[PDB]
Amino acid sequence: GPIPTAPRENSLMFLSTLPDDTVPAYGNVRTPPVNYLPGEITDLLQLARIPTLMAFERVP
Amino acid sequence: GPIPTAPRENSLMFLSTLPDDTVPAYGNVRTPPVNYLPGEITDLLQLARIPTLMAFERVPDTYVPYVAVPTQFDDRPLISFPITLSDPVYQNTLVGAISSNFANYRGCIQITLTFCGPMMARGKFLLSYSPPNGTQPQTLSEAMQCTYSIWDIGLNSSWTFVVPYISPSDYRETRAITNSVYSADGWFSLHKLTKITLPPDCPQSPCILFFASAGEDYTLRLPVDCNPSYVF
Amino acid sequence: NHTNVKFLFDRSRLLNVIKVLEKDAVFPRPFPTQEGAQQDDGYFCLLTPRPTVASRPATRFGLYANPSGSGVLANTSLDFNFYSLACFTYFRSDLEVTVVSLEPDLEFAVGWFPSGSEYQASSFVYDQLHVPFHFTGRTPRAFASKGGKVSFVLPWNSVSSVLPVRWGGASKLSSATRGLPAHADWGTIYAFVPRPNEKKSTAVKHVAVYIRYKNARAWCPSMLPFRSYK
Amino acid sequence: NHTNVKFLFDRSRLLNVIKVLEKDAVFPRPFPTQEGAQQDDGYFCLLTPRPTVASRPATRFGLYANPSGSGVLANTSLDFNFYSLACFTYFRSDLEVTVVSLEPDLEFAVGWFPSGSEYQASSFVYDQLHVPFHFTGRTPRAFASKGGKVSFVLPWNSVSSVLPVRWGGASKLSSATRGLPAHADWGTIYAFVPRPNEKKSTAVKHVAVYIRYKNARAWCPSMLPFRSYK
Amino acid sequence: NHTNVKFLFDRSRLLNVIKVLEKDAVFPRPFPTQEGAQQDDGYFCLLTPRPTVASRPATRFGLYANPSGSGVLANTSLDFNFYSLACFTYFRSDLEVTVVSLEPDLEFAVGWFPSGSEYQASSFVYDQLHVPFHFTGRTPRAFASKGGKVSFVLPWNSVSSVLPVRWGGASKLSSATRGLPAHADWGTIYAFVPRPNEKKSTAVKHVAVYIRYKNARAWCPSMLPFRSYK
Amino acid sequence: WYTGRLNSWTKAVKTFSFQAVPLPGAFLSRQGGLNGGAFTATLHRHFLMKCGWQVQVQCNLTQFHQGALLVAMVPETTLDVKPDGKAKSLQELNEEQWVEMSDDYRTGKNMPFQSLGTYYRPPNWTWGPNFINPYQVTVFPHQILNARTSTSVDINVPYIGETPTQSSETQNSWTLLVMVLVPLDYKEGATTDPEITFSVRPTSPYFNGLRNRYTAG
């Protein structure tokens, strides 16, 4: 049947953190495999765990 | 296939009470559990059931939540009022306050009384209800024809009273812009049945208090927006 | 199947035309009313097929066939189509409301409350700007873009079991007029512009109203209006 | 079922009206504040039912019933409806925000950040055009066409387990005012125009704010405000 | 889960502001460049988080803190947020582009090409009307109504396996500057108006750019920028 | 079990007048001549606490006495401070002897607040969220005190709070108050102006942290 047009409350808007995707532009692409690179990172906790050195202003 | 665009009749509108949800903004959140807090609330009926104390303007700006039995005697009731939630007497009770935020109510009204006086004094009291008529009844004789009950001073100290729900409809107007059958439901009164006993050297002028609460079948309907006058 | 009451009473018809609010304003006061009051007229309308005068229930219908005179004129209305349609002592149904502008390229919102309540008056002041409180409340407020179109369905909202087409009782013991019902309505409707009162404009705006009955039922057939032999 | 707290606290109500940003601007500074500062007011608003003054938490509510005087006026707000509605020592729910323009045919965007953060100041210069940094950041920025309408739902964002309706403790060991909470809010909201500061205009713009509670819960009943016998 | 790189690098941020094309125009030429050339600037922008100058790759970042002087100024940019966010020697992800106008009620279209290509120059003449060839081509061209909004996702388009955050090699045997990468970009973007050059107008138009990373990955952690103790 | 002495009832006391004991804050000042001796100091060497309470009251009237007193546990109250923002002194307690009703308390008007400063205009304060509703006090856990049958007070309130635990020196979520329902009256000769005594017991406490004795800021 015809479009049972149900207008949306606040469409025609731009939102920064909209999770959904958008229309592809230049699909059907192939990429060079990158499995040869070691040292993959998952979360910042990996770097947060490694210790480092603090400092203090030189005593007068 | 392509969007079979079916335009909607009145889209691009903003509506106050639209039930559906909207787009999430900052999802993937975690919250601290709150199970440790007791005293959860489900519906306003929980607060509406708990009784409270009414009040009356001081007999000739200080309202009083108590009444003292006088030594003088007259056939007229000592204290009476219409059963209408808009009256000042309910204007601070929890039930009255909650009802003020609704279009209509439904159910019975529960009333409680308490005595506070001497040791070796006794007496009798009569409780009555009168549906609406030409004018409020005045004489205990006229009141006696209506529904009434006997409350003895000495048997107990709080002879609970409940006004039955009577009306020619399914509900009644919470507020009365103009007097109407569905709005007012007559009055309620108390009568001194016999002279009380004054024992040796005891103080005089005992004290009596009254409490109101919503009946088990009490129910409201049709929420509304509040009057913001109390800010002033 | 055309004869079915449901298949008949399911179409929209015009009801009345009203102006657009620009301030808190005072609500009309009951009759008889003396002069000098600040109550304004032509802004609030009650949802009822039965005759009404000055946004209040009425018994006798009138019309201003004589334009000249002195005093304040009044609004009136009656659902010609509904009354001529058929005969039914009793009736009940959900009332559907719709509004469309009558001015060039206008935007606004609409406000409603059910029976038994009354207009909320007074206004606040924000950063030296005065706004009536009727903007916000417990009841729905609707918003539409320019051009404008408003639609929604209201549920039954009156204490009485049904709506009496031709009633003959009385409502109160003293001074009550015989035959005048009490709450045969779905409430009151009003329109306003989301602008501060400080920016009021002289030009008046006007808007029409359309209603539609959904899921109608009837009882106790009756008579139909007479037509002359002139 | 009308008595259910959830069925009651699920409707939109107006909160406050604010102007539209046109530059980086300085954020208000805590109290007491001395004169000569460049902090500007009436651009930032905090999301909180409890009373607030000059976009900051407060304890006592005030109103400018006396217009005349000297100095800088301040903003205030309090959810009349929520406070009058019921009694609950504790409360928690997701806060839904919505905004609509109050000027003819305007377009803009809105910006928000949660509690604990603060406004980002300073501005860049592109090809001799100055733009505040608040345009871009880690947090959402919303865009709407002319006319305007903004809607979304924010999740709970405060460290405290619930929101205290009437609290009586203190927040810090020294100088802390008794009873003044710390983070009973959902953050701060602000509006701005996607134009360079170089093209600022004198005419002011104003915008209203509406909020709605979703999935409300309560604990520990309480009392209700008093009303006079005058 | 907030610490996840994917959950972090999935939000839009501003990149740069550019003017609107009105003619074929000459593309910028490599450095050093002598005076008298017709190459125009501020119309083409390259998609790259790393620092760039005059729409070309660069190594050292600069800023025009001193306004006065003589000569031609240049554009610059760097993703402050991305660089401050975290440490990763290598990175790859699809780049999402979005554009919004910065002028009142404007309509236009956008044009793009990937890396390795270059702007197509020259123009045709139809019935005494001159139109640049860049209107039509092998690559996408997007069209939007007045007001304007453009969105789409570009796939990875560079020969290199990943994007190096801090590279230290060289690209060519002779004269190549150490550490300057070759094709760490997603191409170039540009905007234009679908009108003949014969109807050019003096008033300039400006437009902003927003980008977003999708499906990000990283390798070989690194250090973070220093902050002063001043 | 800590015990304390309050001021003595007199017929001069009006109605709706009151006095309150904010626990555990009153301990710091040893309100009503009360010295726990162990918990009082143990709080100082710790910072975070989580415990319940259990209270009691007493007032001896006689055959020829009449009156009515209201006692209840009202949480999150802030009535134990002067309008400026300072707690009252022992001299002030001995002077007032009772808290009399006022429109300020009815409206929450004069509760402590921060002065705006020289930058702002002076706002007109009208209302606050810590108002007092004299009539609806009965909603919270409470009991009556009638001269004919007033024996004693008893209550046991579970723990409450915006968080599972709070700082001792600042936390205040429970408070005991007494209200004069009916003004006291009696025939001369029997007990005149009976005294009021209060007892307090915490339950299931959990003291947290460790440090030297707390030092004033």
Author numbering:
A (entry chain B): 1 to 60
B (entry chain B): 1 to 60, 67 to 238
C (entry chain A), D (entry chain A), E (entry chain A): 29 to 258
F (entry chain C): 63 to 279
Please, what does the article write about this entry?
Seneca Valley virus (SVV) is an oncolytic picornavirus that selectively targets cancer cells by recognizing Tumor endothelial marker 8 (TEM8) as the host receptor. SVV has a typical picornavirus capsid with four capsid proteins; VP1, VP2, and VP3 are characterized by a single jelly roll fold, where eight beta-strands form a barrel-like structure that is distributed at the exterior of the virus, while VP4 is located on the interior of the capsid. The structural architecture consists of four capsid proteins forming a protomer, 5 protomers forming a pentamer, and 12 pentamers assembling into a pseudo T=3 capsid, approximately ~32 nm in diameter. We used cryo-electron microscopy to investigate SVV under acidic conditions and in complex with TEM8 at physiological pH, identifying multiple uncoating intermediates.
We used cryo-EM to image SVV particles after incubation at pH 5 and 37°C with purified TEM8 to explore the structural behavior of SVV. Although the ER-particle from both conditions remains icosahedral, there is a distinct rearrangement of pentamers. Each pentamer has rotated approximately 20° clockwise compared to its position in the F- and A-particles. As a result, the ER-particle is 8% larger than the A-particle and 14% larger than the F-particle, representing a ~44% increase in volume compared to the native state. Similarly, in the ER-particle[C], these include VP1 (S1-S28), VP3 (P61-S66), and VP4. Density corresponding to TEM8 was not visible on the SVV A- and ER-particles under acidic conditions, suggesting that at low pH, the virus potentially loses the affinity for the receptor or binds transiently. A similar SVV ER-particle was identified at pH 6 in the presence of TEM8 (48), which lacked 43 residues at the N-terminus of VP2, whereas our ER-particle at pH 5 lacked 62, indicating the incremental impact of acidification on particle stability. The ER-particle has novel VP2-VP3 and VP3-VP3 contacts at the twofold axis. Overall, the SVV ER-particle is defined by rotated pentamers, an expanded capsid, reduced inter-pentamer contacts, lacks the genome, the VP1 N-terminus, VP2 N-terminus, and the whole of VP4. Our results support this scenario and suggest that our SVV ER-particle may represent a reassociation phenomenon of dissociated pentamers from genome release, as shown for enteroviruses.
